[PDB]
Amino acid sequence: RLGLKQAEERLERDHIFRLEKRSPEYTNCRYLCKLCLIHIENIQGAHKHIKEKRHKKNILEKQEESELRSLPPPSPAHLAALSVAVIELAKEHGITDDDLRVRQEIVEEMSKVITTFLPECSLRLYGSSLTRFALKSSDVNIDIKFPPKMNHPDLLIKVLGILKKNVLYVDVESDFHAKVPVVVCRDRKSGLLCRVSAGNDMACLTTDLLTALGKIEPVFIPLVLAFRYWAKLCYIDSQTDGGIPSYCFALMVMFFLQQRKPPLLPCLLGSWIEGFDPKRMDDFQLKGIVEEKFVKWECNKHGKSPLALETPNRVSLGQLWLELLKFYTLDFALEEYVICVRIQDILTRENKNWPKRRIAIEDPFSVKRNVARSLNSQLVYEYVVERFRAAYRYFACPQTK
Amino acid sequence: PQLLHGAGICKWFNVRMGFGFLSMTARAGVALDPPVDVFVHQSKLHMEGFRSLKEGEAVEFTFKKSAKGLESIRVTGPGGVFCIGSERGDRCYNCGGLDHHAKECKLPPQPKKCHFCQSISHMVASCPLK
RNA sequence: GUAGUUUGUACAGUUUGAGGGUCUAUGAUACCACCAGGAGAUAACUGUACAGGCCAC
Ligand SMILES: [Zn+2]
Ligand SMILES: [Zn+2]
Ligand SMILES: [Zn+2]
């Protein structure tokens, strides 16, 4: 009797979880695998599921994180080594404010080249570059302002051809088929890409938000630089290939600082708005950045919200880096929530009605759609979690010369 | 085919080095009385795989003349069948049974019986009777 | 809330590559013996869903 129960518990050791009373549609199944998130018919199905090939991927995939999770916390020498590594990443080839001077002048050169024959237009630096929330080899986000007596896809015809006859740059992709039609360029001084978008005001507002946070908090730049670089080496930052957007990585690390108690950034909505309700959070729509320490808001009444605290970081950067990797490898349950840095408590998928079997992330000035829908394949999802696993494996591992 | 056939019974057979001896009841289709000794070797054996005989099973063969007992050119079982080998596609991990596998043996699962002491505690490869 | 349209992915049976210390090796009496604790690895047909996803309501 009970020996058969202990042997089906030996099946449960390989992640088969039984039920006794079930939903009428779930009457078909006595078991479930929480790794595969798929209901399982019976004890024979459990015997099947211990052989089942996705579960074998799921078993090893789940067992992998326990190693890195057990890998040791940094010693003071290890802390110094981690800090030295991330600052030399940030400085030697990462885009600091000093390198941002070069990238801003590159954006100015793009403006010069394009507005040589589109003088009414104007090109605006924004995105991960301008924030200093950057990476070593990066693409500058450039935004065309244009008079609205013309169509921006039509205007991109007048944008592309100069670059298609340019003498300064390489990598001129005719990237009209992107969701925002752009023309791409590679500056050859920095050796790095450039992307010429237009009219993306909400991205520029989030850019000013993150730049204000970096003005308040220094670690901001170094930490995200590091994270982005890592994701790139790990090819997670390519949103077209089932990955996560870099903008979304920036908001991800902002959420990390927003939740790593004591949180080194302050949240945008709360009790200082007297009579605020998080259950009608959408009504409290934010507006433009004020003084690079505040963000505005307005509804149909309006005001501003603080982006600062009374003291900056006084904790070692390597500790911040290791716990930043620990946050989005082991702490933030990627599939259960939206990365929602509008609110201290995490906003769920069904709170914005989005599906669940991937990460969800929101734009700060547009909570309309998930900007993390690119993960859909569970194989690519397991690959991304495996890259995060390799991150928290190596960077928790001590070294030898 | 040859005229040099024969038949009889196995005297003995080593599996590992692959030779033995036979005692023959027939020679070239002619019956014999008393039986004669005739060799068997794995280079002479017709079977595939690890060619071996049960040490006493019935056989058929072909021969040629030899001093240390007759030498076989070919050896088979009776009627040309494959020889057995010394008589002593895997054990079902639900029950230990060779004849079935996982979905072939869908009975409710069992804990680890140590086969050396016949108790459900551990594994026979860790039991010190080895 | 329920469909017609196929994908990887579990898939259920079939057909399956190894049958798994497989491998092995002394030409005239020595083999067998003596270390397993692990739900058994791909391509094809077929039965359903996951969820990506086509045409609708
Ligand atoms: Zn499973
Ligand atoms: Zn069996
Ligand atoms: Zn024992």
CB-CB under 8 Å, A48 with B109: no
* Coil, strand or helix at B124: helix
- A85, two tokens: 């590594």
Neighbours of A170 (CB within 10 A): 11
CB–CB contacts below 8 A, A to B: 28
Residues of chain B with CATH 2.40.50.140: 5-80
Q: Classify the phi-psi angles of B56: left when phi > 0, otherwise alpha if psi is within -120 to 50, otherwise beta.
A: left
Q: How far apart are CA B46 and CA B52, in angstroms?
A: 10
The answer to whether A186 and A192 are in contact (CB under 8 A) is: yes
Q: How far apart are CA A360 and CA A357, in angstroms?
A: 9
B97-108 exposure pattern, b = at least 16 Cβ within 10 A, e = fewer? eeebeeeebbee
The number of residues making up chain A comes to: 401
The answer to whether A329 and A64 are in contact (CB under 8 A) is: no
Q: How far apart are CA A55 and CA A37, in angstroms?
A: 10
Side chain identity at A134, as an amino acid letter? A
* Coil, strand or helix at B126: helix
Closest to B61 in 3D by CA, of B107, B100, B22, B92? B22
Which residue in this structure is represented by tokens 């006794």?
Answer: A20
**Taking CB atoms and an 8 Å cutoff, what residues of chain A touch B111?**
3, 6-7, 10
**Taking CB atoms and an 8 Å cutoff, what residues of chain B touch A10?**
109, 111
Picking from A32, A51, A70, the residue at the C-terminal end of a domain is: A51
Q: How far apart are CA A312 and CA A191, in angstroms?
A: 34
* Coil, strand or helix at B125: helix
The answer to whether A208 and A289 are in contact (CB under 8 A) is: yes
* A207-A211-A216 Cα angle (round to 5): 150
Query: Residue B80 carries which DSSP code?
Result: G
Any domain includes A107 = no
CA distance B4 to chain A (A): 55
Closest to B64 in 3D by CA, of B1, B23, B6? B6
Domain CATH code at residue A378: 1.10.1410.10
- Give the contacts of B117 (CB within 8 A, at least 6 positions apart): B127, B129
- Give the contacts of A73 (CB within 8 A, at least 6 positions apart): A322, A396
Helix axes A317-326, A378-394, angle to 10 degrees: 150
Which residue in this structure is represented by tokens 């590679």?
Answer: A186
The answer to whether B71 and B63 are in contact (CB under 8 A) is: yes
Neighbours of A12 (CB within 10 A): 15
- Give the contacts of B60 (CB within 8 A, at least 6 positions apart): B5, B6, B7, B8, B75, B76, B77, B78, B79, B80
Task: Give A274: exposed, middle or buried? Use CB within 10 Å, 0-12, 13-18, 19+.
Answer: exposed
Any domain includes A182 = no
Any domain includes A269 = yes
The answer to whether A163 and A176 are in contact (CB under 8 A) is: no
Backbone angles phi, psi at A291, to 5 degrees: 60, 10
A interface with B, Cβ–Cβ below 8 Å: 3-4, 6-8, 10-11, 43-44, 47-48, 51
CA distance A90 to chain B (A): 55
The answer to whether B72 and B40 are in contact (CB under 8 A) is: yes
Q: Classify the phi-psi angles of A285: left when phi > 0, otherwise alpha if psi is within -120 to 50, otherwise beta.
A: beta
Picking from A51, A68, A87, the residue at the C-terminal end of a domain is: A51
Sheet strands side by side (includes A31-33): A17-18, A31-33, A38-40
What's the domain range around A297? 234-394
Q: How far apart are CA B43 and CA B93, in angstroms?
A: 37
Q: How far apart are CA A251 and CA A292, in angstroms?
A: 17
- Give the contacts of A242 (CB within 8 A, at least 6 positions apart): A374, A375, A376, A377, A380
* Coil, strand or helix at B30: strand
Neighbours of A370 (CB within 10 A): 21
Q: How far apart are CA A328 and CA A384, in angstroms?
A: 11
SS3 readout for chain A: CHHHHHHHHHHHHCCCEECCCCCCCHHHCCEEECCCCEEECCHHHHHHHCCCHHHHHHHHHHHHHHHHHHCCCCCHHHHHHHHHHHHHHHHHCCCCHHHHHHHHHHHHHHHHHHHCCCCCCEEEEEHHHHHCCCCCCCEEEEEEECCCCCCHHHHHHHHHHHHCCCCCCECCCCCCCCCCCCEEEEECCCCEEEEEEECCHHHHHHHHHHHHHHHHCCCHHHHHHHHHHHHHHCCCCCHHHCCCCHHHHHHHHHHHHHHCCCCCCCCCCCCCCCCCCHHHHHHCCEEEEECCCEEEEECCCEEEEECCCCCCCCCCHHHHHHHHHHHHHHHCCCCCEEECCCCCCCCECCCCCCCCCCCEECECCECCCCCCCCCCCHHHHHHHHHHHHHHHHHCCCCCCC
Closest to A185 in 3D by CA, of A243, A142, A126? A142
The answer to whether A182 and A110 are in contact (CB under 8 A) is: no
CATH topology for the B5-80 domain? OB fold (Dihydrolipoamide Acetyltransferase, E2P) (2.40.50)
* B106-B108-B112 Cα angle (round to 5): 110
Nucleotides in chain C with any atom closer than 7 Å to protein CB: 8-14, 18-20, 23-33, 35-42, 50-53
The number of residues making up chain B comes to: 130
* A113-A117-A118 Cα angle (round to 5): 95
Which residues are near ligand 3, the ion (C-beta closer than 5 Å)? B 114, 116-117, 127
Q: Is the peptide bond before A355 cis (omega within 30 degrees of 0)?
A: no
CA-to-CA dists, residue A64 to A162, A252, A309, A331, A384, angstroms: 51, 23, 38, 15, 13
Task: Give A23: exposed, middle or buried? Use CB within 10 Å, 0-12, 13-18, 19+.
Answer: exposed
B interface with A, Cβ–Cβ below 8 Å: 94, 102-103, 106, 108-111, 120
Q: How far apart are CA A161 and CA B36, in angstroms?
A: 101
Q: Is the peptide bond before B34 cis (omega within 30 degrees of 0)?
A: yes
Q: How many domains does chain A have?
A: 2
Any domain includes A211 = no
Q: CA A9, A14, A18, A23: dihedral to nearest 10 degrees?
A: 180
Q: How far apart are CA B40 and CA B59, in angstroms?
A: 10
Closest to A252 in 3D by CA, of A141, A85, A139, A372? A372
Q: How far apart are CA A112 and CA A121, in angstroms?
A: 10
Q: How far apart are CA B94 and CA B104, in angstroms?
A: 10
Of all residues in chain A, the one with the smallest CA distance to B111 is A7
Q: How far apart are CA A254 and CA A332, in angstroms?
A: 13
CA-to-CA dists, residue B62 to A23, A231, B6, B26, B33, angstroms: 73, 74, 5, 10, 18
